[PDB]
Amino acid sequence: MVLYFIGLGLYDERDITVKGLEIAKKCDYVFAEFYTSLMAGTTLGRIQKLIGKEIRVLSREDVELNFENIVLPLAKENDVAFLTPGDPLVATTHAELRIRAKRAGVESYVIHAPSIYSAVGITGLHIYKFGKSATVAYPEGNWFPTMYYDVIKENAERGLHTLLFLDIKAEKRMYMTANEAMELLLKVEDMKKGGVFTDDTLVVVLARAGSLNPTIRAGYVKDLIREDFGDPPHILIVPGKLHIVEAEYLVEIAGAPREILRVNV
Amino acid sequence: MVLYFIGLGLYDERDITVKGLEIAKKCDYVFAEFYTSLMAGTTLGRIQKLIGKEIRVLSREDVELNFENIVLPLAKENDVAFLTPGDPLVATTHAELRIRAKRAGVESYVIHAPSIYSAVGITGLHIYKFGKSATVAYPEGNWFPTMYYDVIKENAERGLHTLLFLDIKAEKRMYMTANEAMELLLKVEDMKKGGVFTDDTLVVVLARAGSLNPTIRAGYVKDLIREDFGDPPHILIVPGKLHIVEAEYLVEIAGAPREILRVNV
Ligand SMILES: Nc1ncnc2c1ncn2[C@@H]1O[C@H](CSCC[C@H](N)C(=O)O)[C@@H](O)[C@H]1O
Ligand code: NA
């Protein structure tokens, strides 16, 4: 009958919306993927208990190569749901799956859930001031990604904040920490020498957004690069020019150095 | 001793998270504000019933001028909830309320919910390609603001998408339509001649995000300017150059003309 893309939220099984839970509980088949992000405060068991259904977990290969062969066929005679961490269509390629649904003659609906993209609002940074976003990918082999460095540069030049999604290798259970992202950025800085990311750069770290006590820290790279921000997932933000109110929140809530209050207008 | 900032989500009373609802139910006092935005798909009465607690509504002045006299005193000896549409702190001024909480010796926690910032992912446009965001405001008397026009120009310039919030008179329950926003943008173009927004500009309109049946339309201004997109709230997006996958989604899901596949990619 129909296919539902339902977000599970930021941290635990309760970050799903009431709308999402009520709809998920009535579906005949429930699929899910847990490779696009990490929900550090729950387990498949708890999610299954809350929804009261067995969930078939799909790999990136199952989705990217066989979504129309695994999920869509059932969505023809049944109500099917496809669950994902955070919001289904944020920093994923899942939107394209709706195109496959259409071609397969399957109607699809989207149920949103809290997302890291908007959750960054808890850092006190004005969300409208964010510019282009990027992802810090783990170097592999002789391939060392560095494009995210240029994104930061372009944004900072315009006084905009840069949100940096951090890498994740779900199968290896590897989640990139803000510390690793900073290390990589310093290395890129040495090669490019654009003066974009140095030990004196002010950065912001948000770890485990969604939990009741996420880690929110702001400060210079030289002081934060070896700080313990707790378990993943983490996101790194490189702010552009700060408004006084943003600085005030970073100081009061994120433990930032009180000197950033002095904005060089 | 605890204050909870809880997001209500995008459209109706079921858009709050399970975590947000359960926490609100265990709170001694539940406050709410509807001056930053409105919940178009529901009513105070319906939200009040779902939570099963009397909800005290606060005006902009109640919050901005007297938050520490109305809400904080109670949170000193009780568990208090402060409900807001969307995701807490996405509204710029609310972040500062956490500082007021701190100075009153009150702990505060944030319970996230979907925001239009992440919800726009449903347009098929890549979230990372969005640039600086802006709000389109109605001219008045001798005042004609046009800042939002320059934001579109700077983003598009760099191949980034521009998310445009449309004017809302929360208290008067009046919404600016995408049609009105397009008319205004054409006026600004006529005045600035930047070639930023014209009859040939491709735009995307998202109406009632959060609803199971939102309106997602994409096309050129000349064709959409007088189209009916349904009841508010309306969100207008001026895409930067598209990735073929974005274009395909707009055509297949948003009813965009095949033309965009060659003109806007
Ligand atoms: N709760 C959380 N706290 C901190 N970072 C998070 C996070 N959830 C996701 N991320 C960040 O985003 C990356 C996944 S990108 C997929 C995001 C998802 N669709 C959403 O809407 O949130 C992670 O590697 C991490 O860097
Ligand atoms: Na943005």
Token digits of residue A20 = 């999402």
Bridge partners of A198, per DSSP, are none
Structure tokens at A112: 């949103």
| Helix (H/G/I), strand (E/B), else coil: B58 | strand
CB A158 within 8 A of CB A168: no
What is the distance between the terminal CA atoms of chain B, rounded to a whole angstrom? Answer: 54
Nearest-CA distance from B124 to chain A in Å? 6
Q: Please compute, for residue A54, the number of CA atoms within 13 A of its CA located in the half-sphere on the CB side.
A: 1
Query: What's B146's domain CATH number?
Result: 3.30.950.10
Distance CA B235, CA B178 (A): 7
Strand pairing of A202-207 and A215-220?
Answer: antiparallel
User: Residue A160 has what DSSP assignment?
Assistant: -
Please state whether beta strands B215-220 and B202-207 pair in parallel, antiparallel, or not at all (unpaired). antiparallel
Say how many Å lie between the CA of residue B230 and the centre of ligand 1: 33
Report how far residue B242's alpha carbon sits from residue A42's, in angstroms, rounded to the nearest whole number: 37
Q: Which domain holds residue B25?
A: 1-114
Stated as kind and residue range, the H or E segment containing A166 is: strand A162-166
DSSP states of A49-116: HHHTS-EEE--HHHHHHHHHHHTTTGGGTSEEEEEESB-TTSSSSTHHHHHHHHHTT-EEEEE----H
User: What does the alpha-carbon distance between residue B224 and residue B45 come to, in Å, rounded to a whole number?
Assistant: 35
Dist CA B38 CA B182 (whole Å): 22
End position of a domain, from candidates B71, B94, B114: B114
Which tokens sit at A25? 């509980």
Tokens of B245: 């996958």
Do residue A127 and residue B90 have CB atoms under 8 angstroms apart? yes
Are the Cβ atoms of A102 and B253 closer than 8 angstroms?
yes
Buried b / exposed e along B148-165 (16+ C-beta atoms within 10 A): bbebbbbbbebebbbbbb
Residue type, B241: K
Going by C-alpha positions, the residue among B170, B232, B208, B172 that lies closest to residue B36 is: B170
Resolution in A: 2.1
- The Cα–Cα gap between B167 and B180 comes to 10
Same domain, yes or no, for A162 and A138?
yes
As beta bridge partners, residue A234 has A207
Query: Does B224 lie in the same domain as B127?
Result: yes
Which residues in A lie closer than 8 A to residue B92 (C-beta atoms)?
126-128, 245
CA distance B256 to B227: 13
Q: A216, A224 in Cβ contact below 8 A?
A: no
Phi, psi of A215 (to 5 degrees): -95, 120
Same domain, A121 and A30: no
- Count of structural domains, chain A: 2
CB contact under 8 A, A96 and B245: yes
Q: Count CA atoms closer than 13 A to A106's CA, side-chain side.
A: 27
Q: Is the dihedral of CA B218, B128, B93, B12 positive or negative?
A: positive
Within 8 A by CB and 6+ apart from A43, the residues are none
As a residue count, chain A comes to 265
Residues B143 and B256 in one domain: yes
Co-location of A104 and A119 in the same domain? no
Tokens of A155: 């944004």
CATH number at residue B94: 3.40.1010.10
Same domain, A160 and A235: yes
Question: What is the C-alpha to C-alpha distance for residues B216 and A110, in angstroms, rounded to an integer?
Answer: 12
Distance from CA of B21 to the nearest CA of A (A): 8
Among residues B114, B136, B164, the one where a domain terminates is B114
Q: Rounded to the nearest whole angstrom, what is the distance from the C-alpha of residue B6 to the centroid of ligand 2?
A: 21
φ/ψ of A238, rounded to 5, equals -115, 100
